[model samples]
Target: NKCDVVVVGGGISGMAAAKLLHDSGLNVVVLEARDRVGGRTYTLRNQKVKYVDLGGSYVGPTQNRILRLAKELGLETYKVNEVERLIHHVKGKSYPFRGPFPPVWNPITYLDHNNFWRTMDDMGREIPSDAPWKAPLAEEWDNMTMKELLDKLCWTESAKQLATLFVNLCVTAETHEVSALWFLWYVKQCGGTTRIISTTNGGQERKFVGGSGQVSERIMDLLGDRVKLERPVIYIDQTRENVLVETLNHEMYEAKYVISAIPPTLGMKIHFNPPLPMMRNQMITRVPLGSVIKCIVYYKEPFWRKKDYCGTMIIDGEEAPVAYTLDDTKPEGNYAAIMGFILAHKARKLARLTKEERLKKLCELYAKVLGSLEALEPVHYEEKNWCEEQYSGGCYTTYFPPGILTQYGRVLRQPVDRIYFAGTETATHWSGYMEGAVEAGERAAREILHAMGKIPEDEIWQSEPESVDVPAQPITTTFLERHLPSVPGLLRLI
Candidate 1:
């Protein structure tokens, strides 16, 4: 098969890129390894629950690209079910708090919490979104791990654990495994740690009414048969004249331009005829994917809501397998559920356990946090172990370890010969989110259009889509305002 371009992944990035190119009258074909589209945005359908996003589900206020795409596709989003209180389980004790701050009885924990975010926010400002490697303290920051930064700052044990939980929630990786510079860059990309973590103005504030995967599915419907499923490209041969891509089944594809829209680690698995540049190869090899198992527990009704709980819980300590969970109730109130994340090291350990054992443990944990024994008898349980997937090695996103970004960050988005890169990781802003994926796709398509002389260089970047009007309420304000008056001295600090 021959086309103007061949996109090597059917995720949001590749689909968005292909859609743009095809809209411009370019002949483009998308090759996806999986049998379906939407890549990491996996939505599992259920009779009682309607749907549950097992993968990348949320879109925040600042993520314009995804919001625009959803609106253009005639999709609507609903705010996540608001929780009145957040249950914190630490050292076998569950503490319920009203605000975003974790309920830590020790004054030192509060001081440490304030200090840690202040330092991170300050350091995050120094790193530019376009080029984190060129930051003033790049070398020093890139050489140290998040673990090292905690030690140097002399964080208390509780503080360290809390910080680690944030990192795990952010990138789905342990703090010790990622570089401090890269972590700071991520914080800067999302505006701040609070924006990235909080639900009100944060990355997880809203979800698609049906499912996040609907965006890609609608795109695929628009493209018709241009996308080929179960076709995994195994080799790429790029020359001055054109690019040749070969699939596992010996099918051949030729194109004037090729867009590798897969994850960096998965892209490395393909055999390049002349091999990628040393830096490119090294970047792919060193950038590790984070691990996560997204689990959704379903009940007959909104049990937590009945108990005046918001269905949000953050478990402290390594003893609990489930890290974080939030209300995943349907808008129509047909079914109620709590979506939980079994992350990083714990995910690795729990992956080895039988499904029954894992479900039993999760039920027990939820029972304790929700203060209801009814949790133990949930009608349904669903889990997706992203780490075990062949096409997708992990979930959420990949991260750069110590020293890799400073040394080879420049090559991350650099094109080689006829091949271009487009993925969420290649984006400058909101890089691990769906917004980043759409942005990268549009950017890559524009770059190719410019190279072909079909568009001017000035027109390469597309205009931002018309803004969606979201309701003006602190998504978390309802709970905070109602509960703050009950806690003395805490209101002033909040």
Candidate 2:
């Protein structure tokens, strides 16, 4: 079979590119490895929970690309219920705090925390989002691991622990796993650390009415049979005129252009004819997906609300598997639930145990944080260890290690002949989330469009959707309660 273009992955990124190409009247084909679409985003249906998104569920401010796409698809998004206080359990003692971070007991720890974020926020602006390695301190920063940087910068143990926990929660990797340069770039791409982690008006601020997976499925609706599932690309032989794509079952496809819209490591799995550029191959090998077990435990009612708990828990100290959590109750659903992320080393260790044991451990931990014994008796339980997935090595997205970004970051999205790359990792902004997927796909498709003479070179960089239907904002504050605009205003209440 032959087409104008072949998209080797049917995730949001692949489908987004294919949809854009198809809309431009180009014949496009999408070949997906999994039986279903939406690579990392999986929305499962349940009798007790109604529905749950095991991956890439949340949307927030500044993630306009995905929000625009969802609105265009006629999908409705609701705010995650978080009108109450948050629980922060550190060293076996639980502290209820309002808003993003918990209060610090020691004055030195508080100063250290503020200083660390201030340093990161200031340094993040120095690194270019599109080309991180171009920064003046790229080599110096990339040469050091995040752990080393933390040790050098943090004045208090509490400060280092909190910062490390933030990274683990956001990227699902330990501080020692990634480089300081990569970490700064990651934070810059998604605005800042607070924007990435906060629930109110942040990444976890809103969720789709049905499921985030439907974004890909809805795009598939327009393409119809152009998308072929269970057809993982095994080989790619590209010549001057065209590229030949071979699937696992020996299905062959010929196309003028090919887009490998998969994860970085997954790109290494394909057999490129002339072999992908050496730097690209080397870089792909260096980047590894993050570890995470995204689990949801459903309950009969929103009992946490009665105690003035927002259902957001941040666990500190060692011996605990769960790191961060959020209130996952829907506005119209009959049941309520709390979403937990068993991340980094914790995720790997728990994967060794039985799924039943994992649930048992998390439920007991949740009881202490939520301050309710009802958490121990969940109505239903769901866990998805993304590392167990064959196609997706892990969850969230891949990151850079020491000496990586400075060495090979330039080739991340560069096209080689007729081969192009599109994934959330390739995005300049919000690289780990769904917004990045949609934006990166559009960017890759535009590159091809420029090649086809359908669009000018300048058009490739700056362009927007023909029109975007703006989605409604979350209604967290009531008419009587004035919303806090800044961090100090939120702290005033405490």
Candidate 3:
């Protein structure tokens, strides 16, 4: 087969590129390793009832690219329920907390906590989203691990554990597994610590009407038969101007250029003619995706709502198996459920246990926290262990360990000859997010279009306007005030 360009993955990133190039009147073919599209953003469908998202579920303000794309795709968005308080679990104790911080924290440690995140916010701001290596503390921060940063900053025991919990929440990796500089850039990539962590007007704010998976399927609908599945690119030879692509099934294609939109580690799997550079190969080895098992416990009704406990929860300790949770009830409120995560180190250990065993353990843990026997008997339970999924190198997204980002940050997203990279990890904004997936893909296609002389260089760096609107919740007034006099006393109010 022959085309202008061969996209190396069918994830949103690669799909985005294909869609753009095709609309621009270029011949492009998508080569996906997995049997399905959407990459990490998979929605589990059951004939039993509506589906639940097992990966890359949420999008919020400032993630403009995905928002704009979703809106244009005719996909409607809805916000997650944050009408109830956020729960914090520590040392076998659980309590409701205000703001992003817990009330259970020691006063001194609490202040230290504020300073640490605030400091990180400021530091993240200084980091250029496109090039974190140019930041003032780039080398200094990159050399140290996230665990070490907490060790030096946290003076109290409670604060140390509390700080560690924040690092654990994301769960593609542990604190020690990532670099301080890289983490800082990651936070800034989304927005800031304050906005990234909250639900109402926060990063985990909204989800699609049907499921996140539909976005990719919709694009595939547009691309039609051009999207090839289960076509693993086993080898690539780019010695000549024309790049040759060979799949595991012996299918071959030649293209003027190539866009590798898979994980960096997955790229390592391919046999190349000339081989990759010393630094790029070494960097791929270091870029390991953190593991996670996304679980959904469906109940008969909205039990937590009646109990006045919001499904929002975070349990962190040596014994707690799940790290974070959210109300997984659909926007239509059809199937009421709680979504919990078995992440990072915990996911690796839990993955060894059978699904039945882990389901029992998670239910028991929910029973303990929710104090409801109903938790023990869910209507249905579904889980996606991304760590076990072969096509997906891991869940969430690949992250940089200490020393990697600074040493090789510049090389990321940097085009190599006729070979280009466009994955979530290669993204500058919202890296490791669906937003980044769309952003990176759109950017890569634009780069290629620019190279082909179809578009001007100025058009390559494009800005996506905020295409969707999420109104701000009223703060000065409460629901109680708004409905104070439904009996028409407002007309006689003095």
Candidate 4:
């Protein structure tokens, strides 16, 4: 009935927290709402094809948390198939070109692109990953939306459309839906805009050999029966020193500490006995989940590769429902696949249509981009509309609208009594990615450990003997002074 920690949501964050606590000799139990673990990271196995990651799939250089965990689990990774030529679709025309810039953009638009990146990079430098709200212009930046920022900068129509597409690609939200400060904070968390967007040397450069879900599956294997599947917590009552958690099926759990590892929006659905603070509740209410429908089309062979194509396509206009597509073929090359993301408003519209209709429309778009009738006929096709799922309201991640981050973002991860928050949304770096989930889980575990006096604050960093390799570049005092002068003490902990 009682354990050291009751971890809600058996996703990567919950599993990671439970694993760390269990390794520390604590009795930690993970309660998952779904029938299985892995949460948003679902690996769909196929008899004919090898596998298709229907959820969060890739990681890249500098994403040490997930990469280290995969290595620890004895999992190997492979680079995403390089893009031979990128297909840029705009105004009902498709242009094939190579390099970073989209082929369809004009010279004037390229100037706007340069200005946009420079401004974003400059703003990102002002925002620290640990406490973005502490930035001097946080209030001003948060008050404005990405749309407003683009308009104020006087970006060309092409540049504006490209920026909007990029925002939709990353956060699964429209440019107007996200706070400018939150966007800058995200850029900082990813190290820069280029690192976040680029396929090569970017956040989407590589994927695990088996699948990203295998990382969670392996952790669950180690945890064994400690994780309870199909158990969704409905209510939480925090007592003086213990927290009582009640599932939808009326199952009760008691723990010294509780970790709500679900998304902020999902967390708001549960009833708290005493109710959360007004700011925290308002913050959760304002942070809406972005819409995303992930679709994977399988072919008998790498048809696009035969034409010296990498199967990468970016649809820039409003005509197509699908926003991006990439080659998802395995190393064996026997079964070739293309993965696509239908995002934001289009994804919401597509979610209402039948699967057959959605597949037909997707194939039609593929045919247009690939310039072949063969795209219309596939060996197999699968899609997952994350927004329609009961447990996961949406995929990719959640976002803060205008003024939300500066007003109430500080309390997002701050524990209330015996309850603590741990999810990709709460991560200081790589937030909205698998690496963020792992980092947040570990951070929450460490916070609890320090609070209980099980580990001293200064010694906590040294306690993790199995931790990933420390950065080759040490955190210099000068860098800390420049970026995180106010929070120098916390820099050592990271």
Candidate 5:
């Protein structure tokens, strides 16, 4: 079969690009290795319960691109007001704190404890959003590791542990493995870490009314039969005149352009015709995806809220399987859900464990935070280890050791021949997130349309529906009260 454009990967980026291209009157064919769309943006649904987001769970208000896209698609987004006090179970003691509001600590105490704040404050005012790479002090911060900075700051043992837990939770990798500069960049992009100054909701925190897949499915509805499922492209050979795409089943597709929407790690597996450029080759070799494991357990009820906990826990001392946990139960509930995040080497270990063993570990951790696991029987349990998925290789993007955002990131964004790359990893501002993924997809689509002479400078594509305006609602003031069980399934409070 021949197509004007062949989009590789069935993730949000590929689907969004395919939708735009097909709507522009182009014969676009999408080749997704996976059987389903949404990719890392996965949601698990059951007959009796609201959706549980097993991947790329939350989107914040500042994430305009995704928020607008969700509104346009008529996807109702529930406010993420469930901020139970952040329980730091460190050294066997729990310290309570809340979100959208930080603690009132002195500058020295804040800088000494949080390794991310000092450098972030320094670069926050310096790096303009538009020209991130052009920051004057980028090189100094970019060249250092988090460990090195922490050493310079002389962080206390408790402080180091807390900072490490925070970064690992966000990056989904070991702190020493990542660069300090990327941490600074993240804090800068997320605004500041100070109380009141920080966003009430977490960073770009938003989710589809039903789930993220609702938005992905809506995009597919608009595309209809233009999207091909379970068609994993094995090879792409670009010649002077045209490009040939070969599927794993030996099916051949010819197209003028190939938009590679696969992650960097997965993209390396495809056989490029003449091979990618030197810089691209280095990116494929060096840039690593953030390893993330989502452990989902459905309980008989939302018991964690009974205490003053958000079902959230951050353990700094031990290298346990679950690093962070969140209340996944919606307002209305047939079943309550809690998700735990495991990173890097730990994710690999959990992925290899038997189902029984995995559940035991999860139960142990839950017992530590909540009262006892005896009363809580899991209705169902599942884990999506992104690192184990052969197609994905890992969850999303994060800074690898010695990664220079400007050099590696910019090169990663550049298109080679008729090939274009799009994923959350390539997002300019919100990398490694749903917001980044959406922004990256739209940006790539616009680029392809412009290159094909399909989009007029004065004309905009009304292919996607118009976005709805969501008014900002204040987060519940008290932490524990905010997470009280709501009526499940119906959008009513309990």
Candidate 6:
């Protein structure tokens, strides 16, 4: 009936929070809406090839919580080898490319191509490492869109298109729809996108020994039966003293504190008694959910490596079948595996079609790039469509046209009465990333412990101010100026 803390959403954030609280000698009950854990960081093993991550795979050195946890677990990570000879297909012609070159490094890449690394570097440099969002650059660039920034940079057409490849990875939406400030700020905390390429010192350049799911599994293992799977919380109510949670199946739970790690989109779906604050409600409505569909095809062998291909593909052509392809199989060689990733926007449209139709389209794309479709004939294909998932409607959060990270950003993670928030989306440093997710979980657990008199709030973050005012505006121009375009767009389509 009652526990020390109630964690909703069994994803990494919720699980990590539960683990922290439990390990600290507190009773924690985790309520997950889905049948399993690892919300966006999903791992699937098929064709006897061990584990392949379907969502949120990469971990970098800059990601403190993730890297430290990996070390604690004794999880081995491998650096993502430099993408040498990137293959791009335009008008049916395959062109090989490499490195962060001149035009590619220019600003135009930011808008046309979503050159995430360069744009991130430009933005990150603008912000001081400590308190990134509060810095001057956040305001100065708040008015600009990633597209606008690209225009200012005067990047060449090809460079612009190439930039889109990186931007697409973050927002998973058209670059024009994302806020330049949020996009840049994200890159800033990520410690410049290319930093991962040069060194693994930060652990920012790492992937799990298996897939990211293995990391999730490690957290779950630490929690044991404390995690309740298949129990989706349908409603949350805040009493003066306790918080009550109910699942879709009519299961009920109550606790002194409730941690809502589910995204704002899903949080809005649940009934919250006393209702969330207006600011919180607006954040839930405004935060952008990235559109991405992860597809992993298993081959009897890794064929791309045989051709001296480095398990990476950059597709730029219109009507491109797959956006990016990576060799996820271990230890190289043809017997390994290659994975194809398609953002949700592209994948959502294809969701209505049959599996056969999807595979056909994939193979067709392969033929265009690899010069042959024979290697792509997988024994079977595996995919996790985030749009259709029960709890997480999409993969991760992305910068919206406006109201993100700038106006509506902070509220997404702010607590509502006894209900607290966690997830990469709520993370201050690496929000919408794995590191942010872990950071949020640890922070939330500490908050709950302090609230319950189990720990002293002042004891943590001793170097920081006790409670700095984050200045909330009831009706800020940020909403109208930055977000109107994206708001209408999210509603216009699926």
Candidate 2, residue 414: how far the Cα is off, in Å: 1.3
Which pairs of residues collide in candidate 2? none
- Can you list the residue pairs that collide in candidate 4? none
Runs with alpha carbons beyond 4 Å of true place in candidate 4: 103-105, 459-494
Residue lDDT tens for model 1, 117-153: 6678779889999899999999999999998998766
For model 6, how does the per-residue alpha-carbon lDDT over 211-232 read when each residue is reduced to its tens digit? Answer: 7777767777887787888887
Worst 10 residues of 1 by lDDT: 480-489
lDDT, candidate 2, at 298: 81
**Which digits, one per residue and each the tens of the lDDT, describe model 4 over residues 1-494?**
78899999888998888888999999999999988899889998869666778999988767888877778889888778875887888878778878555753455555556666667878888998889999999899999999899887644777778888888998999889999999989988987877787677677778888788898898889999999988899999985467899988889999899988999889876999788888887788888888999998888787887777788888878888788898888976667888999999999777888988988888899999888788988888888889977777798898889988888889899898888889999988789999889888888888888879998888533222322332222212234224431122234445
**Per-prediction TM-score to the true structure, in the order listed:** 0.93, 0.93, 0.93, 0.91, 0.85, 0.82
- Provide backbone clash counts, one per model: 1, 0, 1, 0, 13, 27
What lDDT does model 5 reach? 0.68
Q: Which run of 10 residues does model 2 get worst, by summed lDDT? A: 480-489
Least accurate stretch of 10 residues (summed lDDT) in model 4?
Answer: 469-478
User: Residue 101: error of model 6 in Å?
Assistant: 5.8
Worst 10 residues of 3 by lDDT: 481-490
- The order by descending TM-score is 2, 1, 3, 4, 5, 6
For TM-score, candidate 2 versus 5, the one ahead is 2
> Residue by residue across 167-250, what tens digits does model 5's lDDT show?
676677776777666666665665444421332445534456678887777887787786778888888887758889999878
Better of 2 and 6 by lDDT: 2
For candidate 6, the per-residue lDDT at 41 reads 87
